[PDB]
Design a protein around this ligand. Structure first.
Ligand SMILES: O=P(O)(O)O[C@H]1[C@H](OP(=O)(O)O)[C@@H](OP(=O)(O)O)[C@H](OP(=O)(O)O)[C@@H](OP(=O)(O)O)[C@H]1OP(=O)(O)O
Ligand SMILES: O=P(O)(O)O[C@H]1[C@H](OP(=O)(O)O)[C@@H](OP(=O)(O)O)[C@H](OP(=O)(O)O)[C@@H](OP(=O)(O)O)[C@H]1OP(=O)(O)O
Ligand SMILES: [Zn+2]
Ligand SMILES: [Zn+2]
Lengths: 397, 394
RNA sequence: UUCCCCACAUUGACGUUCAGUC
RNA sequence: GACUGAACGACCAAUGUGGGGAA
C-alpha cells in the first residue's frame, strides 16, 4: 500500500524512520503504563493517547519520554475562565505540547540555576542572542491516531485519488480549516461567512470554536512548538517527527501537516515551514467503537504522578486549576524572566505584566502567525478563529 | 393486533390484501432463491414492496425484495458514496423501489409507444405523477426497529393486550441504531451532531431507526429528494407485517405521534396508510443473523448480495443501490428530461448534497417533519456528518 | 396514570473453541 | 486469508416486568 508508507523528514535524519516510529510508540505507551499501575488504573481509560519524546543523538536508545497525555474533548463555552485558569483544549496532542512547555521552562531554570548544571541542560546560550537547543537535540510527537481535523477527513477503506496533477476538472480546496464542536470529539468546516466569537455571547450558549488539531499542528510547523511567551527566551523549536498509532495516510497527513500552506511567504529569520518525518507504526491500533472518557490525563517528566482534568470544565474534578493552564505557564515564565538577565532576552520586556500584552512582546512569533493566517486564507482554506480578546487579559499573584 | 383501515373510500379488502402481499413477497423471494435452498437464502428479516394497478388482486406485481438486519461499520463509510449505510430489510426494499421508479421514468421518456406502458404521466403542475390506480404496499416480515418494536418485541398474546403505559415519556421517542450495541436509543441522550473524524476515531455511528424512517416516508414520500425533482410525492398505501404486530405501537410510530405537523408544502401531507398483521404470522428464523443483505428489483436477472458491515459486495464492488449509483441514474434521466418538465428548475452544481438541495419543497417538507418531532418532545433527527454527501461523479 | 429506587429479565459488536467452503 | 456456521464467555444503553416508594 503506497498510502501506508513513511514520509521522510525535511529536517535532520538521525535515525531510520521505522525504527524511530516503533521506538517512540513503544516508549510512550510503556511510560503511560508505568504511570497507570500497568493500565489497571481507572485513569488509564482513554480513546486517544499522545506523547512527546526527546533524542540527544543518533543512538536510538538515548530517548526520553518527555510527556504523556490522553484526551479527546474540549471545554464547554459556559465554563471558560477569565483569569486563564481553564484549559480550553484537552485533546491528547494539545495537552502533550503544553506539558512539553513545562519541560522547557524547567530546562531554562536548570541552566540558569548554576553553571555546573548548564552541561546538563538541553539549552545553551545562542550566538544570535537568547538561547538555542544543543546541536543534536530533537523532539518527536506521537499520537495514538491521526489528529482531528483535515488529517482524518478521508475514507480509510478506499484508495486515494484526491487531486490529479492537472488542474482539478471540478473545483479546488481539499485542505479546509475545521473546528472542534463543543460537546464532541468531532470536527466541522469553518464557515466562509466568518463571524468572530465574543466573550459574554459564547458564555451564554453560542458555539465555542476551537481550531482542529490538524490545523493546530500545522501552526506548530510554522511558528514552532514553544508558543509566543517562550520565544522571548528561546529560538523556535519544531517537531522533527510525527508518529501515528492508527489512521495513517501519507497523502492526507503530509497535506494537513504542511503541504496545504506551502504558499507561505516572508517568514521571519529562523522561522520556516517545517516538514517533519511522518510515519505510522508497524502494529497499528484497531478502532474501538464505544464511549470516550470525559477526562484528560497529563504528565511531564519530573512529575511524580499524572494529573487528571475534567475536559468539559478545563479543571480537575475538584475544580483546581491545572499545572498546564495559562495562569500556571505565566507563573513559570515570570519566574524564569526573573532569573534571566535583560541583555539575554530575545526581545524587550517593555509591555505591561498582563498575559496578552506579554504575548505581544514576541513581535517575530506574532509576525509568523500573521503570515500563517494569511497563508490559509490565500490558499482558499478558510480563516483562523481566535478566542475573544478578554480571554488573555489577566495578571498574577 | 387487528388491521387499522386507511382513508375515506376503501378500495381493497384489508386481510385479503395483507395475506396477498405477504404471500407474494415471500414467494418471489422463493423463486429468487431456488426455493429457499440458495446460499444466500438465510435471513432474519425479509422485506418487499408490492405494486397494485387495480382492484384485481391478481393484477399485483412484486416490485422489490430484500433481507438484512445490520448497519455499516464506522471505518467503512465512503466519501465517494459507494457504501450502503443502512441494510435493515425495509430500508433496502425502499431503495430497490427507487431503482424501479427511475426505470419507469426512463421508460416514459424513451418513446411515445412506450409512454402507455410507464406508470408515470405528465402532471398539470409540471413534472410527473403516478397514473390514477397505482399503489405501493410495504411488507416487512417483522415490526420495524424503533418505536413500533422496542416495547412489546414479542407476539401479542392478543386479548388486546394494549399498552398498559401509553403515556410514558419513552413512547414515540425518536431512536437510533447504535454501532456496536443492541437496542435502539433516544436521541435526547445523544445531543451533539455526528462528525466524520469523530466516527472514524471510534465514536459510535448512529443510524435513524426504521420506525422513524418510515414515519418520515409518511411525510416526505418514499421517492426522496432527488426523484422529487422529477415526480410528485409518492406514498406507501399499506404497511404489512409478517410478525410482531401491535396496532397501537405501529400506528403511533408510523404517524400518529406526529399529527401535530403543520405547514407542509403543496402535495405533501401526513400519510396514514393501512396497517395490518397477517393471517398466519411467520416463524422466528433460526440461527446466527447473517452479515449479508440481499436485494432485488423487478427487471433484474440476478439478486445482489451486499456485506452489511462494509456496504459493498463480496469483492468490494459498489452496490446498484448506493448513493453513487442512484446519482448516476438521476443524472441520466435529468439529461433526458426537457427543462419545461421539471418540478424544480433551480440549477445547482453537480455534487450530491447540492443536487439534493434543488428539491426545495421536499427539503421544506423535511423541515416541517423534523420540527414536528421536536415540538412533540420526541427528539431531534440525527443525520450523517455533512461530509457524506460532498462528492461528484468524478 | 406518571415518575423514583431496587431486583430480575429482554434486545448489535467483541473474545474463545469447534466444524466447513473458496 | 477471506467468507460461512454451531456452541460457549463477556459487553453494549435502552426497554420490560416485579416489589417497594412518591406526585
Ligand atoms: O495549546 P492551545 O490549547 O491551543 O492554546 C493556544 C495558545 O494559548 P496559550 O498558550 O495562551 O494557552 C495560543 O497562544 P500562542 O502561544 O500561540 O500565542 C493561542 O494563540 P494566541 O495567543 O495567538 O491568541 C491560542 O488561542 P486562539 O488561537 O484561540 O486565540 C490557543 O488555542 P486555544 O484557544 O484553542 O487554547
Ligand atoms: O434509505 P436510507 O439508507 O435511509 O438513505 C437515506 C437517504 O440518503 P440517500 O438516498 O442519499 O442514500 C436520505 O436522503 P433523501 O433521499 O431522503 O433526501 C438521507 O437524508 P438527507 O438527504 O436529508 O441527508 C439519509 O441520511 P441522513 O438523514 O442520515 O443525513 C439517508 O439515510 P442513512 O444516512 O441512514 O443511509
Ligand atoms: Zn484533536
Ligand atoms: Zn430496522
Amino acid at each position: 500500500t503506497p498510502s501506508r508508507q513513511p514520509i521522510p523528514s525535511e529536517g535532520l535524519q538521525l535515525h531510520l524512520p521505522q525504527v524511530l516510529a516503533d521506538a517512540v510508540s513503544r516508549l510512550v505507551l510503556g511510560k503511560f503504563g508505568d504511570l497507570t499501575d500497568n493500565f489497571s488504573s481507572p485513569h488509564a481509560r482513554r480513546k486517544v493517547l499522545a506523547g512527546v519524546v526527546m533524542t540527544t543523538g543518533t543512538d536510538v536508545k538515548d530517548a526520553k519520554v518527555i510527556s504523556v497525555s490522553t484526551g479527546t474533548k474540549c471545554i464547554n463555552g459556559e465554563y471558560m475562565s477569565d483569569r486563564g485558569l481553564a484549559l480550553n483544549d484537552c485533546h491528547a496532542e494539545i495537552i502533550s505540547r503544553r506539558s512539553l512547555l513545562r519541560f522547557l521552562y524547567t530546562q531554562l531554570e536548570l541552566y540558569l540555576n548554576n553553571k555546573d548544571d548548564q552541561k546538563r541542560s538541553i539549552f545553551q546560550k545562542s550566538e544570535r542572542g537568547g538561547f538555542r537547543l544543543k546541536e543534536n537535540v530533537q523532539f518527536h510527537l506521537y499520537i495514538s491516531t491521526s489528529p482531528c481535523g483535515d488529517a482524518r477527513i478521508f475514507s480509510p477503506h478506499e484508495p486515494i485519488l484526491e487531486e490529479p496533477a492537472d488542474r482539478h476538472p471540478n473545483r479546488k480546496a481539499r485542505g479546509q480549516l475545521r473546528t472542534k464542536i463543543e460537546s464532541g470529539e468531532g470536527t466541522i468546516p469553518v464557515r466562509s461567512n466568518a463571524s468572530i466569537q465574543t466573550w459574554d455571547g459564547v458564555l451564554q450558549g453560542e458555539r465555542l470554536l476551537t481550531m482542529s488539531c490538524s490545523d493546530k499542528i500545522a501552526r506548530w510547523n510554522v511558528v514552532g512548538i514553544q508558543g509566543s511567551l517562550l520565544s522571548i527566551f528561546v529560538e523556535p523549536i519544531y517537531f522533527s517527527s510525527i508518529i501515528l498509532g492508527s489512521l495513517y495516510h501519507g497523502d492526507h497527513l503530509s497535506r494537513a501537516m504542511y503541504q496545504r500552506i506551502s504558499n507561505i511567504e516572508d517568514l521571519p529569520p529562523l522561522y520556516t515551514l517545517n516538514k517533519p518525518l511522518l510515519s505510522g507504526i508497524s502494529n497499528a491500533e484497531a478502532r474501538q467503537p464505544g464511549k470516550a472518557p470525559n477526562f484528560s490525563v497529563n504528565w511531564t517528566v519530573g512529575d511524580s504522578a499524572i494529573e487528571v482534568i475534567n475536559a468539559t470544565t478545563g479543571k480537575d474534578e475538584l475544580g483546581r486549576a491545572s499545572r498546564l493552564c495559562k495562569h500556571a505557564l505565566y507563573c513559570r515564565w515570570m519566574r524564569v524572566h526573573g532569573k534571566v538577565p535583560s541583555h539575554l532576552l530575545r526581545s524587550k520586556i517593555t509591555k505591561p505584566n498582563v498575559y496578552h500584552e506579554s504575548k505581544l512582546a514576541a513581535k517575530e512569533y506574532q509576525a509568523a502567525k500573521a503570515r500563517l493566517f494569511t497563508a490559509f486564507i490565500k490558499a482558499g482554506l478558510g480563516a483562523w478563529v481566535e478566542k475573544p480578546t478578554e480571554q488573555d487579559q489577566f495578571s498574577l499573584t
